[PDB]
């Protein structure tokens, strides 16, 4: 609903033959790059490949991020699209190569069938039974709970292990509540009071709920979408048991941890059981590392090994820089800001500047996307920027000009409202002239160097 | 009753025209309103448009009087 930089991008706008239509799905031009991004979408949808690298290479404002977000739409919702900047990699909690691995495994998805095996009913009896322990000093302990559950078409009496009674107890269950119990986790949920004895005169603000229909014991099945990283995190910070470690692990502050290769390898074994059991579909996705020049030579040297993994997502890099110094390696210059031995691994999609008539088309697509109804002379005005000034400066003027027109009582933007927008809101270059002319000498009114 | 709400349109307009008659009969005296919850952008729309054009054919085939 809110309008943002890429709201007009809907897809790559390719033909079924995989050729780009010159203006489609919000794009203008970049046709060769849109066609290359199509073949990458094909590489992703065909699950066969791991750890292929793609670089979107081209100057700022050439639509590299529009291409990546268009890929994210051609893949649809099922496939994991995992966007990061290279500046997200420098965590204070864990080494930066941990964050890369977390993002690599966040980019691999799993759809898995799960059977939830549960008991549900109105609690009709609850009777604890206990033993006098030998002198451990903590005193007597509950040995078991007997609990009666009533549903609409049956009842049970359950003799619980005391670890499930602790779930029952920490859930503050009472006689006459409706509860849900998972035999999977031993976990308990208090659903409400019965709709029996639902007298209004409680301060307790209870939700009275109907008796569960059907039998007390149920075995429902549901399909869960998870990433491999979701499994890593669950098993590294255990929280689904009723044991003391799972209990205290919910009270401690959450913190990220440098999950070992040993854990990740053994979760591959676990997930492959789900595949062989036929309960899971593996759905590998894509990791988009925007601003990949902000990675350092330790990140890039780790990506070597990470991409060689027998499962890894597709990695799409974007860079906007020429021959530049590699970060963390001030001795080494290379194109794109990428180490030369890593660049060998990638397929590079070069991305090119727009022509003046393409800029005019983009301005009109963008104007009608923002709902800025805009006269043709006004379009020509805005499209003379983008040629003389960055393309982004065109698109950013459309909103001020709309406000100024509406404040002038116009239904639509004239050249006048842009000519006022051009004056209130400068580009970087006009502002850079103001600096150099005013900071031409120091003083009270100078800009600070 | 004085109000009929169709949660669903039927493929046959005669059945809904019968259904909405239940309130609109010689014993009625309040105004009758009929509401029809056509969910927009769905085949609930095409079902209603097909049923509505059939009612025109059924009215054309009774162009001449039966009186």
């Amino acid at each position: 609903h809110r309008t943002a930089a890429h709201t007009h991008i809907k897809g790559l706008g390719l033909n079924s033959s995989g050729i780009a239509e010159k203006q489609a799905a919000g794009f203008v031009g970049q046709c060769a790059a849109r066609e290359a991004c199509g073949v990458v979408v094909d590489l992703i949808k065909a699950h066969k490949m791991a750890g292929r690298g793609v670089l979107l290479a081209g100057g700022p404002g050439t639509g590299k991020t529009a291409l990546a977000l268009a890929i994210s739409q051609e893949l649809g919702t099922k496939i994991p699209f995992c966007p990061i900047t290279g500046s997200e990699i420098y965590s204070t909690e864990v080494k930066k190569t941990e964050v890369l691995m977390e993002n690599f495994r966040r980019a691999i998805g799993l759809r898995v069938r799960e059977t939830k095996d549960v008991y549900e009913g109105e609690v009709t009896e609850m009777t604890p039974e206990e033993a006098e322990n030998p002198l451990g000093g903590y005193g007597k302990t509950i040995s078991t709970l007997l609990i009666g559950l009533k549903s609409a078409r049956g009842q049970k009496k359950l003799r619980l292990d005391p670890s499930i009674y602790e779930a029952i107890q920490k859930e503050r269950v009472q006689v006459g509540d409706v509860i849900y119990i998972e035999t999977n986790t031993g976990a308990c949920k208090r659903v409400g009071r019965s709709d029996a004895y639902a007298t209004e005169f409680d301060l307790e603000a209870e939700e009275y709920v109907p008796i569960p229909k059907g039998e007390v014991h149920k075995k429902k099945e549901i399909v869960q979408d998870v990433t491999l990283h979701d499994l890593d995190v669950a098993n590294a910070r255990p929280q689904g048991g009723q044991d003391i470690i799972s209990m205290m692990g919910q009270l401690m502050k959450p913190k990220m941890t440098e999950i070992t290769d040993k854990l990740r390898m053994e979760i591959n074994k676990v997930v492959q059981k789900y595949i062989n059991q036929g309960v899971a579909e593996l759905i590998p996705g894509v990791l988009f590392i925007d601003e990949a020049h902000m990675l350092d030579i330790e990140c890039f040297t780790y990506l070597n090994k990470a991409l060689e993994s027998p499962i890894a997502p597709i990695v799409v890099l974007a860079s906007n820089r020429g021959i530049a110094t590699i970060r963390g390696a001030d001795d080494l210059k290379a194109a794109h800001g990428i180490p030369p031995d890593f660049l060998q691994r990638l397929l590079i999609i070069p991305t090119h500047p727009y022509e003046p008539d393409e800029i005019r088309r983009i301005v009109r697509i963008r104007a009608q996307t923002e709902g800025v109804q805009l006269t043709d002379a006004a379009v020509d005005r805005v499209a003379e920027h983008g040629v003389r000034i960055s393309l982004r400066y065109c698109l950013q003027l459309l909103a001020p000009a709309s406000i100024l027109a509406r404040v002038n009582g116009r239904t639509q933007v004239d050249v006048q409202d842009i000519a006022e927008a051009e004056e209130l809101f400068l580009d970087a270059r006009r502002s850079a002239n103001i600096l150099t002319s005013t900071g031409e000498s120091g003083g009270l009114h100078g800009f600070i160097s | 009753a004085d109000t009929v709400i169709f949660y669903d349109s039927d493929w046959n307009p005669t059945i809904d025209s019968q259904a909405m008659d239940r309130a609109h009969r010689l014993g009625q005296t309040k105004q009758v309103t009929v509401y029809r919850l056509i969910t927009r952008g769905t085949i609930e729309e095409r079902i209603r448009k097909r049923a509505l054009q059939k009612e025109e054919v059924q009215r054309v085939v009774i162009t001449g009087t039966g009186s």
């Binding site: 898995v112 799960e114 939830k116 849900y180 998972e182 999977n184 986790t185 976990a187 949920k189 659903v191 429902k220 549901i222 869960q224 998870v226 979701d230 669950a234 689904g240 | 949660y7 669903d8 909405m20 609109h24 010689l26 009625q28 105004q31 009758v32 309103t33 009929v34 509401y35 029809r36 919850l37 056509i38 969910t39 927009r40 952008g41 769905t42 085949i43 609930e44 079902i47 054309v60 085939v61 009774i62 162009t63 001449g64 009087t65 039966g66 009186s67």
Partner: protein
């Protein structure tokens, strides 16, 4: 043919197996009158259309269901599933108490 079957039933000798013909031949056998003429003491019906769009859950059901048209077209099955989600998505998949993947 559904009009013939009624006419065959009442008068099977004549009607054993264009509008200017129909309205003449049926003049004896059908009598019809309408509330506009004889029962105009009643008001007319007010028919109000009440459009509402698919909620975000319904359209998640509906669009993933419509995705099957990329493979099939079963269409008479799909138009019943489409009618379910257009009524309430709990008809198609009942929402129920849920928890993370274990």
């Amino acid at each position: 043919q559904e009009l013939w079957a009624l006419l065959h039933f009442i008068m099977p000798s004549l009607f054993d197996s264009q509008l200017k013909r129909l309205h003449m031949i049926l003049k004896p056998f059908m009598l019809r009158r309408v509330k506009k003429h004889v029962q105009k003491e009643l008001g007319d019906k007010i028919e109000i259309d009440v459009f509402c769009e698919l909620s975000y859950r319904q359209r998640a059901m509906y669009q993933s269901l419509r995705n099957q048209i990329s493979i099939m077209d079963t269409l008479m099955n799909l138009v019943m599933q489409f009618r379910k989600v257009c009524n309430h998505p709990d008809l198609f998949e009942r929402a129920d108490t849920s928890s993370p993947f274990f």
